[PDB]
């Protein structure tokens, strides 16, 4: 009954980023009563002596995306992370809730409407997509943006 | 004819659009495939996004050009949609660089989530001339082997 | 006495790109009478059974950049290639001639003046940098752009 | 004091600027280093470019944060300038992904052009806490070993 957010990000690949950037985002989401599924913690911390470990991580992330209610995708970087992008496309196709996070002020784009490749916004409305687009950790709990509105009906 | 959506970044560069895509299209068409190439098939940005999304919904498989470090973010979104929609999945990379978070695969392990654990290499093409190989997955998919 | 251009690019990493995109660029430069040093052909085609081969390639590229008269840097991609970027910085610091090539229409930038990271343009003039910036292979031989002007005095 | 130019992409992200850079600065400052961090030290775009270029000309060494796939293109330009200007060169990467064209190095081989053939690993730091190691190159450079 508690809504589940899959927190897709590249922050687990860097020690500093994993330790310092992910917990404030997890906490902002948990403070809204969300059950946060963070895949590096949930799925990558495995026995890497097993020949099949990478396949198993992929399948676990896949199943989590299928079972979540929404994705909160950290799309920082030039370009955004290729694994996050796969998960985002999965979420779009599965009609999950979609929320994007980018506090990187660079633009990496093929168009004038969006700060990123237009296909990242294919699951968002033509008008008002900005309401689903978070540019700071402090913005996540805003009652005037889409994540909070989704939680309150 | 089976329909392949040819996802790539090659339309972003004038020279690459002109020279890199037609050999790939020709290779696919020689297997009897109807190729949907989105730069040719294409406010305007939202419309392109919806057109590409509908093409992925309506294809039978995706042939994803995943060259680059990292692979193209738009192609990745389409690959994820294809995986979730149970489309056939084929990957192409003739870029010899590694851009990876693991030792099993040459790329980020999530890109292979739609492929089997054993024999994923059969779906992974590393030259244009490999596309027609009757030992690899595209041929087998077209003929029911 | 013939001027030497170091042709920095990522096109050698892809079979199709190496075979199809590089030769028309080499030919456009050679048609201007330039001696073209293309590092994948010059330096990477080595005995890779030698433990030191990667070190030797790096040193050979380094020496070529030191000995060239100018760099023609293919800065396609989002972002541009990290090895090309190192060579570009080397060329800037060594007061070589600088010419940039990008026919990729995407923008990958931290600013409103330039289509790329502003630091790529640090070796070019504040006003008129566009004269050193080529957006098509057909433009390379233009007598109104900087490469041709450099060759003719 | 020896002057280190701390080249990084971390100023591009609000959270990364706030949380990632100060621990690195602190680690360097504990070795007695004067740290030049360009986002803090900074038409406007050309002026930033010239300021960064002069800082690299005037530093004694560069400490280049080369996280990401690929590493940041601006950092790479500064690294190349530092190599050509005979500055001391130190690399930092706590990103465990490989983005490379070879098997010897974890990154594109050209990034290591300013480092020796044997012992380049001594100049390559893979955690913040490694920065102070008295067995690695930064310490030795500061003390003449």
Numbering used by the authors:
A (entry chain A), C (entry chain A): 2 to 154
B (entry chain B), D (entry chain B): 3 to 44, 53 to 155
What does the literature reporting this entry say, word for word?
Here, we characterize the structure and function of a thermophilic dNDT, the protein from Chroococcidiopsis thermalis (CtNDT). Nucleoside 2′-deoxyribosyltransferase (dNDT) enzymes catalyze transglycosylation via a covalent 2′-deoxyribosylated enzyme intermediate with retention of configuration, having applications in the biocatalytic synthesis of 2′-deoxynucleoside analogues in a single step. The reaction catalyzed by dNDT proceeds via a ping-pong mechanism, with the formation of a 2′-deoxyribosyl-enzyme intermediate covalently linked to an active-site glutamate.13 Transglycosylation occurs in a stereospecific manner, preserving the anomeric carbon in the β configuration in the newly formed 2′-deoxyribonucleoside. As with other NDT enzymes, the active site of CtNDT is formed by residues from two monomers, and therefore, it is only fully formed in the dimer/tetramer.
The structure of wild-type CtNDT was solved by molecular replacement with PHASER. The overall structure of CtNDT is similar to that of T. brucei nucleoside 2′deoxyribosyltransferase (TbNDT),61 as structural superposition reveals an RMSD of 0.859 Å. Size exclusion data reveal CtNDT to be a tetramer in solution formed by a dimer of dimers, which is also corroborated by the analysis of protein interfaces with PISA. Wild-type CtNDT was used as a search model for complex structures.
